[PDB]
C-alpha cells in the first residue's frame, strides 16, 4: 500500500464527496435565481459528474456566484483527481522500469 496508491484512493473517495456535496450545494445556491436550471438534486448530480470531467452540455451551467464557486471547486477536485491517478500510474511504471534494468 504505497503512497501514490493511497493518495489516489483518497482522491477518488474525496471526489465522490465533493460531487455529492457539490450537487447539494448547487441546488441551494441556484434556487432563487430566475431561469436557473440546476434546481433539482438528481440533475445537479449529473451536472457535477460532467463538470468534474470538464464537460459542459449546452446551457447546463450555474448562474449564481456561489453556484459558480461550487463549479470551480468541483472542476479543481475533478482535475486534481484525474491528475493524481496519472501521477500514481507514472510512479508505478517508472518503478518497474527500474526493476527492468536491474537498477
Amino acid at each position, epitope marked *: 500500500s504505497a503512497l501514490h496508491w493511497r493518495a489516489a484512493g483518497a482522491a477518488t473517495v474525496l471526489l465522490v464527496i465533493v460531487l455529492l456535496a457539490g450537487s*447539494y450545494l448547487a*441546488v*441551494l445556491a*441556484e*434556487r*432563487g*435565481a*430566475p*431561469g*436557473a*436550471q440546476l*434546481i*433539482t*438534486y*438528481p440533475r445537479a448530480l449529473w451536472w457535477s459528474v460532467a463538470t468534474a470531467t470538464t464537460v459542459g452540455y449546452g446551457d447546463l451551467y450555474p448562474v449564481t456566484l456561489w453556484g459558480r464557486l461550487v463549479a470551480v471547486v468541483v472542476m479543481v477536485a475533478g482535475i486534481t483527481s484525474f491528475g493524481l491517478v496519472t501521477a500514481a500510474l507514472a510512479t508505478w511504471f517508472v518503478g518497474r522500469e527500474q526493476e527492468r534494468r536491474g537498477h
Partner: antibody, heavy 118, light 106 residues
Framework: QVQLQQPGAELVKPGASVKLSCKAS????????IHWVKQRPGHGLEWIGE????????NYNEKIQKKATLTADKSSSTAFMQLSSLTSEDSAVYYC???????????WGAGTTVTVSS | DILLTQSPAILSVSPGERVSFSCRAS??????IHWYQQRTNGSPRLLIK???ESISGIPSRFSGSGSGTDFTLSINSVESEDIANYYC?????????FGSGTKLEI
C-alpha cells in the same frame, strides 16, 4: 398517515398580519423543501415560496408582491409563513407541500382558509 | 419564468371513453412536468411525475404522454370519481409554475 398538518382557518383584519403553521411527520430529510401555494376562490394554484428547514434559506415569488416571509423551527419540524399588510386580495386557501427537491410536490397539506375582513 | 397553457379550459366527455388534457409550455422543458388532480374542497393530489412516470396508489387508467412543449394527460374509461380540476406543473427552471387548469365534466 397524514404527513402535513395545517390549521383549518385563520381570520385576519384588513392591514393586520398573520403567521401560518405547517408541521410534518413521516420521512423528514435534511434535503426536504417546504413550499406554499395560494388558491383564490374559483382560481388556479399560485406558487408563493419555498424553504429548506435545515438551513433556513427561503425563496419567494417575485412576480407577485412579497407579502410573505418564511421561517422554520427545526426541533418541531414545523414551517411558518409570515404574511403582513393583507387586503381582500389575500383572502385565499393556503397550502403547504413537501418537495423532496426533485420538482414535484408529493404530499400536500389540508389548507388554511384565510379570510380578510373586519 | 415558464408559462404553462392548458387548453381547453372545460372538457366534457362521455362515460367510459378516453380523454386527453393538453398542457403547453412557453419553451422546451424536456420531461420536467407533473400532473395534479384536485376535486371540490379537496387538496391537490399528484397523478403523474416526470411526464409519464406513474405514482403508486394512482389508478392504471391514468397515463402521461409528451416531451418538449406538448404534454398530455390521458384517462381510459372515465368514471364519476375523475370529475375534478387538473393541473400541470413544471420544474425545469426556477421558479416553479402551474397551469391555469382544466376541469373535467362527464
Amino acid at each position: 398517515q397524514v404527513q402535513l398538518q395545517q390549521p383549518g382557518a385563520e381570520l385576519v383584519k384588513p392591514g393586520a398580519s398573520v403567521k401560518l403553521s405547517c408541521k410534518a411527520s413521516g420521512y423528514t430529510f435534511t434535503s426536504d423543501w417546504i413550499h406554499w401555494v395560494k388558491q383564490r376562490p374559483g382560481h388556479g394554484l399560485e406558487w408563493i415560496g419555498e424553504i429548506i428547514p435545515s438551513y433556513g434559506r427561503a425563496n419567494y415569488n417575485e412576480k407577485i408582491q412579497k407579502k410573505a416571509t418564511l421561517t422554520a423551527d427545526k426541533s418541531s419540524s414545523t414551517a411558518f409563513m409570515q404574511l403582513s399588510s393583507l387586503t381582500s386580495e389575500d383572502s385565499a386557501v393556503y397550502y403547504c407541500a413537501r418537495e423532496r427537491g426533485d420538482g414535484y410536490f408529493a404530499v400536500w397539506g389540508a389548507g388554511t382558509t384565510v379570510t380578510v375582513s373586519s | 419564468d415558464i408559462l404553462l397553457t392548458q387548453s381547453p379550459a372545460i372538457l366534457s366527455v362521455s362515460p367510459g371513453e378516453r380523454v386527453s388534457f393538453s398542457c403547453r409550455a412557453s419553451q422546451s422543458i424536456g420531461t420536467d412536468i407533473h400532473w395534479y388532480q384536485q376535486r371540490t374542497n379537496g387538496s391537490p393530489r399528484l397523478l403523474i411525475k416526470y411526464a409519464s412516470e406513474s405514482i403508486s396508489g394512482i389508478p392504471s387508467r391514468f397515463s402521461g404522454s409528451g416531451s418538449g412543449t406538448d404534454f398530455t394527460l390521458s384517462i381510459n374509461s372515465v368514471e364519476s370519481e375523475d370529475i375534478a380540476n387538473y393541473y400541470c406543473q413544471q420544474s425545469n427552471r426556477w421558479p416553479f409554475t402551474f397551469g391555469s387548469g382544466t376541469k373535467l365534466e362527464i
